[model samples]
Target: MENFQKVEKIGEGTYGVVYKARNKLTGEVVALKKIRLTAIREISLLKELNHPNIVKLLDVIHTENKLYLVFEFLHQDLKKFMDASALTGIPLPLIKSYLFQLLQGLAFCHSHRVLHRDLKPQNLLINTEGAIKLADFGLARAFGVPVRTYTHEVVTLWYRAPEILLGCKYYSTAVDIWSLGCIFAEMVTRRALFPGDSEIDQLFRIFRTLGTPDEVVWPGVTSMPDYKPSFPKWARQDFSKVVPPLDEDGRSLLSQMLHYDPNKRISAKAALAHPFFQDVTKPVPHL
Candidate 1:
């Protein structure tokens, strides 16, 4: 506790305030997040994770009212970086590199049977050296043997999988894949692929791009609690129009990830092997 000095406030989460802190003895910097007692699941989940692509939870310090989580400090998140790019858009090489790291981190999480329920640009941290790491596991949950039902209200609207949006109580890592696809598209265009204001709007936006899925395309979709019979059937938009900068392979990969059916969506492991990232040498994390 005495070894670290608070440098400045970094950001705020649903249950905590994050700080940029410096270690007095080692002269090293880190992210210090102070979370309330009720949100202890985030701490336990972070403690169980040990992956280079995922943000490392270094140490935990507890006080009477809150718990402080220590993590390696990162300069900024992908959202800010993309926003800074504006109309110029991120370089294709850098986009490939970042998406590669993202999927690698996702692969590691999925391998551990963990679902990063929320996967948006804001949660993807980037360092000055162009290294990308997945951060903020507040909405994450580990699904062990004997899958259990979970609430459908997990992922953010624009990035949520259709099954969840359709009120599927039981889901899998596919939800994260759908989100990763959204982030990947954003990285290419420097804008959200689906910027829907509401859940229905989000679903419409997705359907507009990928076309409304029929029961044949997304089996069991009709049985979902929220399934609507009157939703407009929109034709799928050309991927080139949505993400003009992406190469054919990249567009192919994105389409696979954004598949309407949870069962048909690409896995994180499979995504890493996709031709879009064929040239990306897996990024090594800074120690």
Candidate 2:
């Protein structure tokens, strides 16, 4: 871990310090995440995951009480691009490319039973070559099949699914669908789909757009943690108002992804095959 020049402190990681460094073996640039020894469990989990959509864990160098993980470098994240307004208000064809790549990655992970609990725009990395990869696995986990719910505290507030907010622990792949819906909304509008000030605020924003879920709509919604706030009266609003600029197919995809019932949420594979991506000019891929 020594002798290699400490190029610069990149930023914080889930369990360690991130730095931009030059690899001695290849003389190429790479990002290193120095993880704590305490995070051995997470490191073990990462060893088995390898996909183009997710950041690859290149190699691990263990030092005294610490481990340094090397990864391929990516210049900027979606947040930086958004602040610069790089492609805001662009045509749907361009939007389809990004969405398609994102779903392909999600489908890979979902096939492996890995849930990227956090799927905000900032976590999606677009490299210098126009490749899109999901960058943060700090909160991701692999679950068994037959569809189940998990704790609600995982995903970021804005992109959290209704089942999680309602406190369902036995849901399935639908968790990621909700995040995809949020991402799609942000891409077209140049802003976050839901910018809730708090948990209460976040839930209300979602309910307002997609309609409040009654016990009949979502059977286990009433028994969730922090489920005290009952949306007394709410109805499904106009999709055009929610996503004012999107065309019919775009709105349809978003609606399916953000469905009230987890069982009804669209899978990443299905979303990839939807009509929205039909107009993508180039092959949507990172590799």
Candidate 3:
């Protein structure tokens, strides 16, 4: 406790404030969160998980009203990482590696049936070594027992899945896949795939880019809780035009992730086997 000094406040989550701090003795920098957990779900889940692409939980310090979590701090998240490369855009090989690392980590979580409800770029920590680790599991949950309904108010609007936005309580891991696809698209173009103001706006933004879904494109979509009969009908636009830097293989892979049908959306394990990663950068993470 006394050995660490808070360098600066980094960000805030639903629970508490995060700090970029450093150790006085070792001079090692770390990300520290000083707050109480809602139900200890994050700590309980993170403590049991260990993977290269998962952020390591270093220590936990407790006080009367505060619970402190110590983590191995990376320089920044993918959100800021992309901003730096905004001008030149991320290189293809680097994008491949980044996307690969993302899937590897996510697949591990899904293999355990844990859903990362929030998968925005800001939640993806990155370091100088061109490595990424998934972070912030406060909103994540395990889907072991079949719950009657999951909350629809979990993910951010821009990265949210259509089913979620349209009030589908029985959503699957495809929600996270949607977020990952949006994050990957932003990585390639430095622009958010579906930047919308409201939940309905978010759904419409998605349809604008990928075309409005019907029972055919997304079976049973017309029965969504929030579905409307008079929704806009825009034809699907080519991926290359939307994400110019994407190659044919990359487009195909993204297509699966952004697939309108959650039941048909690609799983993390299956996405890992996609042809998109055939020429992925060498020295890739050995999942």
Q: Score every model by TM-score.
A: 0.88, 0.85, 0.86
Given candidate 3, what's the lDDT at residue 274? 95
Q: lDDT of each structure?
A: 0.79, 0.73, 0.79
Candidate 2 lDDT = 0.73
TM-score of candidate 1 versus the correct structure, residues matched by position: 0.88
Let me know the TM-score candidate 3 reaches against the reference structure. 0.86
TM-score of 2: 0.85
lDDT of 1 by residue, 130-232 (tens): 7889886534442221112122233356677888778888889898899999988887877788988778999999899889888888888877899889999
Off by over 4 Å in 2: 36-42, 86-91, 142-156, 283-287
lDDT of 2 by residue, 1-287 (tens): 66356689877644457889987767878888775553456655776688877888777677798777777788867666666764545456656777888888889878887777767776787765657788765444522211222322333578888777676666587788888889889878887878887777888988777777777877767777767654656788988988888899999999889888788789999999999877766433222
